[PDB]
Amino acid sequence: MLNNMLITNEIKQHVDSSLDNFNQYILNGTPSKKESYNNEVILAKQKIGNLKKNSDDVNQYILRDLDNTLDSYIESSKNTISAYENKEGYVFYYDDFVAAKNIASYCDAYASTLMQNFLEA
């Protein structure tokens, strides 16, 4: 009941925290935040999993969209990272960069939608 809302915010925070670390890494180059970023998406990814093994018939749809949006996020943020690491310029990964944060906020939109759902009897 509340556990379910609880973990949703953890998911949302992990995604948030992942994007923060991801931005910092692309800007600064600190190899510690790149790994924090990858820790956070794994935890996000993991906790979405637990919510899914006990899905409603309704929120299983929100959860699938959330899970898939995260994957898109992961993919664009890793293409952003990939480009940056064989040193291409900002104009050649700007495109995956903003996509990464666009998609990061999409995850956040599904997260809230998922939590509003968990308001139930």
Partner: protein, 276 residues
């Protein structure tokens, strides 16, 4: 058990036209074992629309049905959804320079033929008819004229009177109708190729005292047009079938999905009977 998700992005999410589209979309979804998520901006907005498309693409939904708010502005996102294996169907408004799997909208040539049939039903097979055409070079209006003209020529001896619409500075419908009626003393009917043309023609027919001497057939269901029909001023109007457009779009998506892989829709006729 989880059903494929189709996203439907409308012009306005509150517009009843697009709610008709949603109902039809839902009917096909229920028949095909899918679910439809109906999205759309409150205010008409290419940006709001494009954002919704982007989220739909990111959520890897099984297919996207979208309204195009500005031509040219959608070809990148569409081709990118298509590239990630998401079938995209454009609805009512097309992005023709794209990899859109299909466009679903009114068959304008057919809609013209239906107008032709209705006019012959209104005034018979002999007499004179004139066309009131706002956009002389607009494709859907050219298509309406082409359908109309072909039907008339093949099923009647009605002469179609031609009028240059240049004076009128590419012309307000009230002004061009005055010209048609003032130059020609024996016009039995007007065929109006857009919704505004119908309103202008009806006003001009009324102002020149020709109500019910000149029948009018037009397009679209605006309040004035429906009021003109109850009132004997406008004989018939040709209306788009929204519900069916939503219905057809889902079935096209589901066909692509299930690998069973068109696509213009019919119209209805409203004359005084069905005005309710």
């Amino acid at each position: 058990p989880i059903k494929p998700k189709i996203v439907l992005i409308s012009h306005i999410k509150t517009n009843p036209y697009w709610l008709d589209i949603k109902a039809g979309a839902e009917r096909a979804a229920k028949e095909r074992g899918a679910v439809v998520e109906f999205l759309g901006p409150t205010t008409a907005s290419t940006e709001d629309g494009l954002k919704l498309f982007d989220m739909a693409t990111s959520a890897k939904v099984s297919g996207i049905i979208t309204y195009v708010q500005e031509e040219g502005q959608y070809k990148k996102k569409i081709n990118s959804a298509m590239e990630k294996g998401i079938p995209v169907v454009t609805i009512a408004s097309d992005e023709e320079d794209s990899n859109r799997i299909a466009y679903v909208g009114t068959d304008n040539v057919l809609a013209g033929q239906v107008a032709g049939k209705e006019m012959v039903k209104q005034i018979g097979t002999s007499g004179n008819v004139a066309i009131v055409m706002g956009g002389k070079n607009v494709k859907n209006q050219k298509e309406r004229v082409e359908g109309f003209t072909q039907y008339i020529k093949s099923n009647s001896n009605l002469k179609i009177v031609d009028t240059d619409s240049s004076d009128a500075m590419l012309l307000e419908a009230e002004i061009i109708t005055r010209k048609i009626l003032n130059r020609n003393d024996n016009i039995n009917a007007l065929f109006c190729t857009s919704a505004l043309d119908g309103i202008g023609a009806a006003r001009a027919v009324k102002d020149l005292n020709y109500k019910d001497r000149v029948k009018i057939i037009c397009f679209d269901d605006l309040d004035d047009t429906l009021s003109n029909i109850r009132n004997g001023l406008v004989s018939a109007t040709i209306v788009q079938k929204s519900n069916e457009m939503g219905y057809r779009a889902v079935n096209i998506i589901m066909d692509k999905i299930e690998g069973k892989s068109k696509s213009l829709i019919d119209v209805n006729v409203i004359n005084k009977s069905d005005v309710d």
